[PDB]
């Protein structure tokens, strides 16, 4: 697996491959799961465990979003905008990431999964949180990478990164990173899925190319 | 190491067992009373294996049977007693196994002189002849040769004597002291045998 | 070898109208890591015999050096072309090597294919054997494709797939193979099998090497990338 | 293994308006000692349902008692005989309820499905409770391979009660002669809608 | 075993072989592996037979209860969620690799659920001992858009390949076509001496008339 | 690394007064997967003797080649072909030579002896053997052997019919291997039937269920 | 298995079953367990069949070479010693043999028990195999030195029958040989225990026998 | 399971051992001759443990000692015999150990009546009294209590009789048959004792 | 650990770190060993195995060089020139690499070392070979990398490589590669040792540098 998150000047871009398992059991798996309209998460490790925490965090995020509502009135590419224009009631990425940390930490004895949460928020702007195997959260203000393939792109991403990257060059960097990881790693392959999260609109990209 | 033998006929049912209380590499006693458990209403439950499991299981079955017979004011049937014992021993099989090998015996107006063989796994069946222990290997075939349906008490006692002599002569644990338990003519009797 | 480290993936081999066609991808994996992707996995034993492997690379290299030394030993003791060893002889040698290694509980962690032409009537190539520098229709009974197993189990068929292909390509072959097949038909069938293997096998690659054992000897076609 | 301790096997076949169930008569001990030669492994549930239990003898007895309890409760509550398929599914559910602490028994259910058209009904399970509704014969026990071979060798569709008896009896006896830990006499039990015939075969007692 | 699924124009076609072996020995030569969950949802199973059968029965009855309560068409995602939540609770000790298929308001939907409680929406799936042969034939011959008949032929070919190339798979071929309006099930889709009287001795005999 | 595998298949053998039949399937399979659909198990030793065997294929092939080599050396040295009994004791010694790392091969040695009498010798891995009228080895053997015991000796039947001849015995062996492929997953594909009379060997073939 | 030898007034009786089984499956009910070591010494097989057959034939070879070298027949004691030393040389290799060598020599009628561990016990009433305890029970309960030949023959047959009856692993046919001064005789070459059961314990044959 | 006992003195050295030949859960013999290995020249090597190891080691030692005594034409000393036996048993300890428990006994004009205790590990030391087997647990303190330096042959035989009665009464292997050796008055004698 | 070898125009540059072992046992270790004046070798895996096969191969190379001689007359950095100007008797790189492969393969039951041989000779020009764990040789015509720290620089080296790199840019590439591997890997650290092998002269560079970004 090669899951990667990279902050740029106006949002955060997450990226993943599609190859599940010597036998390639599946080759169209959607690793980047939509927790909320402003918050996504990349998964690595055991698929069953990852799906379990993903459904639980969807449930918790729906409960939080219902809680956050205040009384009374105020004030192949895909793309859409947020129903919550001003982020009046969307849960924070911080809160979702830490409840995920607590969920994974309470069951260390058998859970084996690493997550990369990424989104946008009115308080902290764009976010990136890496939750490790034992359930330890670290905020990665520049970029986070995880999976078996991520080992082959640490120096590449570290060398190519800049502080305030444009959308085009950040897209090229993350695409080339996932392509290199797929080229070097047998366990990662298939089509590349990228999710760009900004202040107003989320957009989804699919790419069906690989290295030389 | 605990040898048990039992024999059922048309007008008798007899049991026999070695009177050896064993502990590690020594014999605690040559007059062990931990094996037989006589029960009111002409019943007997004969056990082998560990002395502790013997005492606990035998007293549990004895007091439960007596509780039944005093609550309901009647003597329990031997078949009911045997299957009650098997159900109780099977209930502890998967949680706290009693390592006890049971020979149930008795007299009933319903079904004559009954005998039931049963093992530590609670696998029970009625038999005309049964035995338990490593001595069973050496005595059971003798019980095949000399058993016929119309035996008398003396002929059965002679068969048991031949079994005891076989256990003395050939068995690794050269057992020589045995206690019997006869049931015939609406009686229960005890005999001790030195061969 | 106590077990595999740098492992080679499957090989496919079929008979056709003019001879043998054997295909292997050029990838050798270091666990779950494509450390090497230009590895020659099919070896030329002699002008009418080639070998391929799937398993540990060091064991295959050792076996290749053994068979090479056997080939020069044969060539030294040679007077006529009929003195040359057919693929049957090399297959028997590899089978005996694997059996003897199996008796000691010390195998070569490999599955081997030995293939080629089992007769001299179709050409005079081995009249003057050179080591350092239209086709003819050959009968199926004069061709040879062998299999040898890690336990020494061995056999022959009109088409052998070794390794992960045994479940994927073999099925397709058992539907699509037919006697007296042209070069184009054999090529497209092998390409389809390797495409399916590439799409549904992690350790395989899309960089293929085809070798033809034909009346004009062994021919290593230039390697190519499977389209799509 | 646990099944080698006591041994034994059960068999069932169908005919034209008749259906047979057969078993051996032995209680084993430590895989080689025979302690009883009448341990019948076939039990009657109702007039149109019979069960043949093979495996560990204690689990055989407990499963028979539990099934008798449930069947009698169903019959007194409903005031009618049980359909054979209902008892089959009840046995499957009871077996699966003990999924991780199984009863080591491999039962068969043999009966007549009523409608009145007396169709045969044969089913076989394992300890987990995986059924296999089979139309000609059902086999279970430690002598399963020999019984399967004999049954496909000698089965003929649509026999009467007599030829069904000789076929199933020959199958059982030949299968039991090739098993060490199963034999010592054999019960055969042929059901018809009007009567029932149970016989003890003259077998090899060794 | 070869269980197989694929998705056609407004439909899902499942197929399976009819073999059940207790080790080397074939027990049932015409077993049934395609299970009814709902009128618009079907499945096929691989793994431990008892867990498959009883999980499928539990899922079918839960789906029927939910259908009676909500009074709407059952959903494929509901069956997937219930199955995955049940399978993870036992932590892979419920050995059930199940290919689910159905049609609902969200169109056709085929899922492959694995015994540890992970699912995947797919265009086609194969599972069982003979899964690789069926997968090979499917990847060879499957296309982006096809009809009911083309998919039926493809599923039959894949199951036949699994039958011929695998020793744990054999017998006839069954398929089920699940459409929004109704389902349609074919069990045999493909399908590729007398002893004398008194010969057997007896010890005793007795007859009692019921 | 465990150095033993089972390649499956079955080998049935039957005798009469002056003939022997030896059927064997030609399937070869590792574990729920078919290597090939034609791998013969029966080999010719002399003009009046054959050996069939089931187990690991490499052990079987090496053992058969070694036994053929030893019999040919015997013929070259002692100037006469060995009877089935001589080859039987020789096979016993060869199998016992590896007593502490045994051949995984169960053999049936079939032939017709000096007296024009059909003889079989069934074997185990470590060389224990005996004469028999019928025998079977391989994956299917526990299926076929009760059938042969019922048909041939007829212990449990009160009225018997011991009227056997070559054609009925061939049909019986064909039915036996048919049931074997029916209920054994490792038995299938073509089967080869060798018939030895006083004149010599004759080989027939029969297709079975490809599954 | 059940082998049972014993001295009496007019020589020795040896008695064996003929069953042979691979675990639960019965392999053959016609195995020859009493091996003729030489003209006077007999041996009997228990445990592993291959080891017993091979090493008893090897002992026969050694005895023949010794008797040809020295020109006088060997004793039971010397054969027992040679077999015991040969079997003890393979300690720690996993052999499984239980043998009862009985015979006549210039010292008289002799009987020894040997096994793979290296025993050389000397007695007048021996029994080996799975059903050895049952045969011991029958033999010791009725053994007498002054029995006639027929009385001791029926005693041996009854002991073997009871051993086969109780023991799952003993059965098939009973073979009873008698050793005298001038050689030995096969008094019972083979006899099914089916007839023994329905003769000894269940002659009425009106109901299934209950133990 | 194999009991050996030995008792020294100034006018005697006595040995005793159970006569049980055992295999599995049965006694092959009640008159086992596989334990005593008396050597020419007033010497004895009483062994216990496995029958096969007993036979092999005892015959090896006996034939080697006889080879010495015929090559050199003299009687071997008992100290030399004991230490030769110990060295030979030690040589196989790491390679292929004989599981034999040794009591050497004999008479010399040099060193008088000698007795040596030794075990399967080849740990040897001379003693006035020794025993081997689990019976050694029960027949050691009896030897300690009743032994004095100036015993006669009858007093030693009485002590051995008390040891045999103890083995019958308390040891679970109710051993009743024993064979003795008595080296006294420049003569070796044998006896058999029941119960 | 990190051992790298990169071919460039008329030369080959090998490079290594110095760290040995959680507790750093040694921090100045010469992993690049001089088999011959025209042939060097980078070590990885257990140090004892690496040292013993490398000194055995030095012995074998001395024997080969002695036997390669013909009879009669014919015709902080450090720099050395070859005594053999025309390569009349220096052994070939492939011969040494293949006998090393045979040595490691024959005793692969316990040997657990991986080597990168780098050199120059008149037949094949500059040469790189990689001997793997089980004893399999592969000729890497572009570059070879091994060690626990090499996994972090596969994509970096693959992206930055060109066919005919100048000496300066090849030196910068290999130096930055080893620096990145040391930055990412705990098992590698210390000073960088580089060995540049050409047709005529060998250079040996020592570099002390860290990573800042
Ligand atoms: C991988 C091999 O496949 N599995 C196989 O072949 N099996 C296992 C199942 C039972 C079969 C069996 O028992 N077959 C009978 C005909 C045989 N009997 C003997 C035999 C040998 C010596 C004596 C003596 N003395 C007695 C019998 C050898 S084979 C043999």
Coordinates of N, CA and C in Angstrom, one line a residue, chain B residues 80-139:
Chain B
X80 N -32.6 -45.8 36.3 CA -32.6 -44.3 36.6 C -31.4 -43.9 37.4
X81 N -30.9 -44.7 38.3 CA -29.7 -44.4 39.1 C -28.5 -44.4 38.1
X82 N -28.4 -45.3 37.2 CA -27.2 -45.4 36.3 C -27.2 -44.2 35.4
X83 N -28.3 -43.9 34.8 CA -28.3 -42.8 33.9 C -28.2 -41.4 34.5
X84 N -28.7 -41.3 35.8 CA -28.5 -40.1 36.6 C -27.0 -39.9 36.8
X85 N -26.3 -41.0 37.2 CA -24.9 -41.0 37.4 C -24.1 -40.6 36.2
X86 N -24.5 -41.2 35.0 CA -23.8 -40.9 33.8 C -24.0 -39.4 33.4
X87 N -25.3 -38.9 33.6 CA -25.5 -37.5 33.2 C -24.7 -36.6 34.1
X88 N -24.6 -36.9 35.4 CA -23.8 -36.0 36.3 C -22.3 -36.1 36.0
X89 N -21.8 -37.3 35.7 CA -20.4 -37.4 35.3 C -20.1 -36.7 34.0
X90 N -21.1 -36.7 33.1 CA -20.9 -36.0 31.8 C -21.0 -34.5 31.9
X91 N -21.8 -34.0 32.9 CA -21.9 -32.6 33.1 C -20.5 -31.9 33.4
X92 N -19.7 -32.7 34.2 CA -18.4 -32.2 34.6 C -17.3 -32.5 33.6
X93 N -17.6 -33.2 32.5 CA -16.6 -33.7 31.6 C -15.8 -32.6 30.9
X94 N -16.4 -31.5 30.5 CA -15.8 -30.4 29.8 C -15.4 -29.2 30.6
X95 N -15.6 -29.3 31.9 CA -15.3 -28.1 32.8 C -14.4 -28.5 34.0
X96 N -14.6 -29.7 34.6 CA -13.9 -30.2 35.7 C -13.9 -31.7 35.8
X97 N -13.2 -32.4 34.9 CA -13.5 -33.8 34.7 C -13.1 -34.7 36.0
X98 N -14.1 -35.4 36.5 CA -13.8 -36.5 37.4 C -13.2 -37.6 36.7
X99 N -12.0 -38.0 37.1 CA -11.3 -39.2 36.5 C -11.7 -40.4 37.3
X100 N -12.9 -40.8 37.1 CA -13.5 -41.9 37.9 C -14.2 -42.9 36.9
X101 N -14.0 -44.2 37.1 CA -14.5 -45.2 36.2 C -15.5 -46.0 37.0
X102 N -16.8 -46.0 36.5 CA -17.9 -46.4 37.3 C -18.4 -47.8 36.8
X103 N -18.7 -48.6 37.8 CA -19.6 -49.8 37.6 C -20.8 -49.6 38.5
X104 N -21.9 -49.4 37.9 CA -23.2 -49.4 38.6 C -23.8 -50.8 38.7
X105 N -24.4 -51.1 39.8 CA -25.0 -52.4 40.0 C -26.2 -52.3 40.9
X106 N -27.2 -53.2 40.7 CA -28.4 -53.1 41.6 C -29.4 -54.2 41.2
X107 N -30.4 -54.2 42.0 CA -31.6 -55.0 41.8 C -32.8 -54.1 41.7
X108 N -33.7 -54.5 40.7 CA -34.9 -53.8 40.5 C -36.0 -54.8 40.1
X109 N -37.2 -54.6 40.6 CA -38.3 -55.4 40.2 C -38.7 -55.1 38.7
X110 N -38.4 -53.9 38.2 CA -38.7 -53.6 36.8 C -37.8 -54.4 35.8
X111 N -36.5 -54.5 36.1 CA -35.5 -55.0 35.1 C -34.5 -55.9 35.7
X112 N -34.9 -56.7 36.8 CA -34.0 -57.7 37.3 C -32.7 -57.1 38.0
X113 N -31.7 -58.0 37.9 CA -30.4 -57.6 38.5 C -29.6 -56.9 37.4
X114 N -29.4 -55.6 37.5 CA -28.8 -54.8 36.5 C -27.4 -54.4 36.8
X115 N -26.5 -54.3 35.7 CA -25.2 -53.9 35.8 C -24.9 -53.0 34.6
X116 N -24.2 -51.8 34.9 CA -23.8 -50.9 33.9 C -22.3 -50.5 34.0
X117 N -21.6 -50.7 32.8 CA -20.2 -50.3 32.7 C -20.2 -48.8 32.2
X118 N -19.3 -48.0 32.8 CA -19.1 -46.6 32.4 C -17.7 -46.2 32.7
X119 N -17.2 -45.3 31.9 CA -15.8 -44.8 31.9 C -15.7 -43.4 32.3
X120 N -14.5 -42.9 32.4 CA -14.3 -41.5 32.8 C -14.8 -40.5 31.8
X121 N -15.0 -40.9 30.5 CA -15.6 -40.1 29.5 C -17.1 -40.1 29.6
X122 N -17.7 -40.8 30.5 CA -19.2 -41.0 30.6 C -19.8 -41.7 29.4
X123 N -19.0 -42.7 28.9 CA -19.6 -43.6 27.9 C -20.1 -44.8 28.6
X124 N -21.4 -45.0 28.7 CA -22.1 -46.0 29.5 C -22.8 -47.0 28.6
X125 N -22.8 -48.2 29.1 CA -23.7 -49.3 28.5 C -23.9 -50.4 29.5
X126 N -25.1 -51.0 29.4 CA -25.4 -52.2 30.1 C -24.5 -53.4 29.6
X127 N -24.1 -54.3 30.5 CA -23.3 -55.4 30.2 C -23.6 -56.6 31.2
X128 N -23.4 -57.8 30.7 CA -23.4 -58.9 31.6 C -22.1 -59.1 32.4
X129 N -21.0 -58.4 32.0 CA -19.7 -58.5 32.6 C -18.9 -57.3 32.2
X130 N -18.2 -56.7 33.2 CA -17.4 -55.5 33.0 C -16.2 -55.5 33.9
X131 N -15.2 -54.7 33.6 CA -14.1 -54.5 34.4 C -13.4 -53.1 34.0
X132 N -12.6 -52.6 35.0 CA -11.9 -51.3 34.8 C -10.5 -51.4 35.4
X133 N -9.6 -50.6 34.8 CA -8.2 -50.6 35.1 C -7.4 -51.4 34.1
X134 N -6.1 -51.3 34.3 CA -5.2 -52.1 33.6 C -5.3 -53.6 33.9
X135 N -5.9 -53.9 35.1 CA -6.3 -55.3 35.3 C -7.4 -55.9 34.5
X136 N -8.2 -55.0 33.9 CA -9.3 -55.4 33.1 C -8.9 -56.2 31.9
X137 N -7.8 -55.7 31.2 CA -7.1 -56.4 30.2 C -6.8 -57.9 30.5
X138 N -6.5 -58.2 31.7 CA -6.1 -59.5 32.1 C -7.3 -60.4 32.7
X139 N -8.4 -59.8 33.0 CA -9.5 -60.5 33.6 C -10.7 -60.7 32.6

